Amino acid sequence: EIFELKAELNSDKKEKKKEAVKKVIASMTVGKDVSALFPDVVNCMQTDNLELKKLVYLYLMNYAKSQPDMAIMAVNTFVKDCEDPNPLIRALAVRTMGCIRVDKITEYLCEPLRKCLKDEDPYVRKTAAVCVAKLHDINAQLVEDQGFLDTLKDLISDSNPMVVANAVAALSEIAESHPSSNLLDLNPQSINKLLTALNECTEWGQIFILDCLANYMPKDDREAQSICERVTPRLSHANSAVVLSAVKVLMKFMEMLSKDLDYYGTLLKKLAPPLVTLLSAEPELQYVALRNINLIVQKRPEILKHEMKVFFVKYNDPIYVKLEKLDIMIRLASQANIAQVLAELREYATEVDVDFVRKAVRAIGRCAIKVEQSAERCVSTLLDLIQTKVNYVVQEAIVVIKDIFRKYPNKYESVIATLCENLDSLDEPEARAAMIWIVGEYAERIDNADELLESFLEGFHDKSTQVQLQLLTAIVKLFLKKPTETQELVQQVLSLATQDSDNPDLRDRGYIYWRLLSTDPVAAKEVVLAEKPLISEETDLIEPTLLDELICYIGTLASVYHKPPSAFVE
Amino acid sequence: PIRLRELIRTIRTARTQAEEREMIQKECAAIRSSFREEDNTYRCRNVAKLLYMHMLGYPAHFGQLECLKLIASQKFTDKRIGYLGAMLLLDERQDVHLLMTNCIKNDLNHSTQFVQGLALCTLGCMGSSEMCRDLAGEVEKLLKTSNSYLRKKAALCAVHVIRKVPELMEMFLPATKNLLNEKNHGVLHTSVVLLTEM
Amino acid sequence: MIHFILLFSRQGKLRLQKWYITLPDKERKKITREIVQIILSRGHRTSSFVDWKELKLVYKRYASLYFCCAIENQDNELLTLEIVHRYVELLDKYFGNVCELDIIFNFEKAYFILDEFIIGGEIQETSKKIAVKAIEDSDMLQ
Amino acid sequence: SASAVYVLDLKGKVLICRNYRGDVDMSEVEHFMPILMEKEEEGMLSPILAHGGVRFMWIKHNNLYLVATSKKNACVSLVFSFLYKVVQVFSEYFKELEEESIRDNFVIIYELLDELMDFGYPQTTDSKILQEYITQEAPRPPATVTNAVSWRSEGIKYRKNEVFLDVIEAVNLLVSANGNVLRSEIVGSIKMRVFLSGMPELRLGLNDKVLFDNTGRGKSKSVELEDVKFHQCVRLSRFENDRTISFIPPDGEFELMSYRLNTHVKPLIWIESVIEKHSHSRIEYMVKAKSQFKRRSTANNVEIHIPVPNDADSPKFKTTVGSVKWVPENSEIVWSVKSFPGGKEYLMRAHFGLPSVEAEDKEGKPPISVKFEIPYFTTSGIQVRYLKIIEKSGYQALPWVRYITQNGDYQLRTQ
Amino acid sequence: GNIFANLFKGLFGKKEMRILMVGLDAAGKTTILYKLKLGEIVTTIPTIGFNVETVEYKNISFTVWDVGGQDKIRPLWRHYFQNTQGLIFVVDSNDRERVNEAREELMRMLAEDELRDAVLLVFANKQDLPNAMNAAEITDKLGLHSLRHRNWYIQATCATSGDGLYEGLDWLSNQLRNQK
Amino acid sequence: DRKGGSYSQAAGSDSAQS
């Protein structure tokens, strides 16, 4: 096996050497630890056929960190191959040299990189540009000593737009790890030159050319207007990332644009069709598009204000896309499309996804809280859902009703009778507590509030801390409001929560309630049953400082998670 | 009437989860069509395929009445298939085991030692709080018999009934008295287990 | 008494299952998945005993396919292993060099043998030849 | 900024891996399968995974998921675009996407992976251009990659100059259960199979609404495409200046332009379906399909998928025209119609059995989907006006184009 | 297609038909089924489950599925409504207090949209005591004539004797079979 | 012929627009 393979690889016949190389590649791909034979394959490296040279280079790259000591026998071969007339061989050698993760090998590779930096072949130039970035990532000090920054800077100002884009990408990668000292930023002439090659750059080069403008900060409207005019054609790119990159560049440039001029209006009008087109991409890109829309929605919501139909989740849409569709609809929800939003939510409540149902209920509640003009419609929909006899739907409706009552309970007394008998046997802590709180605060439209609380007092000492606290608060409120029918109920609650209640917070609350009852029951009406101020809703809009930073970081990992780039990298 | 081996080979030939689900649905459509026709000749193959699909993770709710019908059947293979289906897809929470009490009572007095044993095993495996209430009288009748192969089954059924109905242990005291002289190891083990449970 | 007995393969596929506790179908599936994950996520020196949900879940696989049991905390643990070994030997004797292929195809015979051997989580016959003779007599009835 | 591009299998085995940056250990792929299983089993499964400080963002292919590990704050959109380009290249090179070719085409697969991306930054993605430098059955790289034109190889000569176009229409209609259409979007698709000699510069011309308004002829039938996306060959500057679509078509079939605009017209097919499902006893399917399209057009291969009960068995079909078949694998009534003349009306009366025992869990309401495909029908009214084929040598081109209308996202919500 | 085999089978008798056995407990259903199948008055314990048997008469295999009248088994009659072609109702004229319950159960069973082709088959059971009513008083009390699109037939059978079974079988055969 | 509509020849440019 191993001995036979070594003998075949140590033969003078190329027909057996190629088969041995193929078998070694298959074993490594099949999951065989062939790193022990690295020195044996070192001899069979300088071959005229390019088919075996690529396999040897790949094996060395995959077996470079494993046997760094045995890799010292390849510098001469790389140096010899870095001068072959064929551009493909030189490019392969340059790619393999930078892929070798050897600390003692990159030192001697500086000369080949310098020689290939000024290569006439555009493929050789691209390979050298990639190898320079790889070496800088491996060793920044070696790259700085070699003086490759000056050569990289001149790459952008030369011919071969593919090579220029590769050099720009390498410079951006180097500056990304750089401490911002001695930045590679360029004046407006460099930006114009890069834009000149943007129309001739490839799909991959287009992203590299557009990423450079993401760091530049415009200072004048004329420069910003020219940049916007040049990036306008980028919205008609078939590549989804190119369109996203153009949109991000336009958003970044809009921070210096003036809304008084008509350029801002044209940019806003030309961006909605791009968002609509991006919303029809692959399901994998659907999540990225939704994240980008949510990030840009909080900044300029007037662009996609009239775009509501495209936010509807499709039947075959993925779960990750369905969840983002609800968030997009909630962020773009308005009274103009309130009926459409309610209809979409009603249809989303007939599915089978428990997580999807909970998300739909939360979105409906958020839409009802945000806009008070559709409060009656939301209440009617919640009542219909509660009558639908769905356990998860019932819990979601109970939570939504409890949230709405604390927000807009002035005209919420017309639904207390319907919720008085709505299957209170549900044991969900998020629903039972909400129902208890609603009964305690809304103990005026129901004449059987005391009777309902009797069923919930059977296991108050062993139900839950939050549930017990809510029940105690409801009992105290009922006693303060109507103490004739709840005189003994308050005493029983105090006895159960003060004598048999071992909860520290619950025991303290019970003791405080007992002291208030025994001190001044009249004062408890103005102390306990007081008019609370308006509840401050938790705003879903991000902080303006984070939005500005998130605006520049568009299409990256920090945008999908909606977190700062330094709060997620390791 | 596809054979169980053919269905197993077809299932093993499925690689993708979606492909396996599609094949299972295609087989279940034919199974439901055969059941709706009141098939009685090759019902064993359909029952085996349905049991395999249920064990493979497919629903078998519609295949409840067919098992009840096969339990009260006369074919030995059909009776065995019905007993297996009742043991597998039948439980206390099913709510369809109430009708199985009549079938168990009918098969409890069967002269065949295998049908009665199969019914007793099914009752022990799927004992209910109400089935044991209406089956306690028949269990005690078989507990006083001298059938060595049936003594262990009767002891197991009594133990299951006592576990399901602890208040019915009073009816087993006069039946297990003077039962420590059994020569058979299984009968002695069953008697010891019943005494320990009591 | 054995709460449940499950025959599952190393890949996770279950070739046999017999639970003596009336549980919901979704609950039973979740319990089976958890047991498979625990057994599949255990080493070869775990003692073949697991206390899952206060149940002495014993795992003892003599081949690629393993075996599982659910014994309450009221009896010895070695008794379950002895019973499992006896059941495996009886199945091999009845089948004749029992392999994984015959288990999937001959699941009905294995279920019948288990029913004739263990009923309600407890054993039905201590001997190994009497059970084989009874199974053969039952099968010969047609 | 992908660190390593790897290809897994349905059993979690990595069929092929290609490290790009090397900042992530190769042993992290083992936890990808358990992480994916946990995410799927808890509803948190997403194409972008995260193994601690390393993110595994990948999409699911026909047979394997192309998961690419990354560590820095790399562009997820760039990774997705690279994965899509790799999938397209594999489809162009390999006719099938399965495990049979991964273990059989490794010699060319490794070379393609090495040449496509270096250090996580792809440089070449054209399958036609890449086919001249990497073959499975090597000369210097072609000048097309180095030159600006990376989508049209020079020196191509053919006996004839014939280009076949395809105006493919996608009718997407989202009809709610109330009977009203919510989302009605029609996306145009102009796909051309360019086969000419040399490097012609195609100058496509149509009766665009914007172009007609600019020229002053905004009174005839003009297509008002909300979104018009040109291909890589289409010059963005020319389209931005005066709506001039000037580009060099590639050698073969490719997507040049893709119109996309909303539609405010009535549906070409009106489906009136009823569900007289008795409580565990029987069910009725009073489905009536009315063709609102033009009578001169025929919908070839009409496939109206009607979701029948999942547990329905012993069904009887009472229809008028077309073959109706129930597929147990799909669990729906396939209203298959070979040819549907415009204005035709098909009435169906379903009747299937139902078990007495109710289902343990709900199954939802799948939407009814129609698969009508009527060629030679242009609902949007957009007609090609001209196609300026200009070559330096000088030749008489014979361009061709066809209009095909099919049903896209034409799903009808159930009641 | 060829139907020569079907014609040959029908020349000597091919139709079998089906039947159902429903009614209240202790209504003579088990005894009636035993008399129809065997011909003897067999005493059995109350039907906890159900009894399935077949009767061969006039070249037709009349399969009968007895259903008990237990309170917990009253709503279980819907299981036999699938693939059911016949239905026979046994009344209990000896239970005045249970007559209303039996009528309500019959009305509830007749209020199913799936069991519509099953003609009515009323059997006057317990026709041995002087307190039993005639074949019209029970029908008038139950309002069998008010069953629109339902073919009901009242027949009185004595469990101890067995008289009237032949007439009921002939009526059922005439209602099911519409040939010579 | 061909399913989906027979192929039709296209013009060269807008002859009516000069």
Next chain:
Amino acid sequence: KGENTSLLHP
């Protein structure tokens, strides 16, 4: 394979 092997190999 590993499945055709006997459970106990006896």
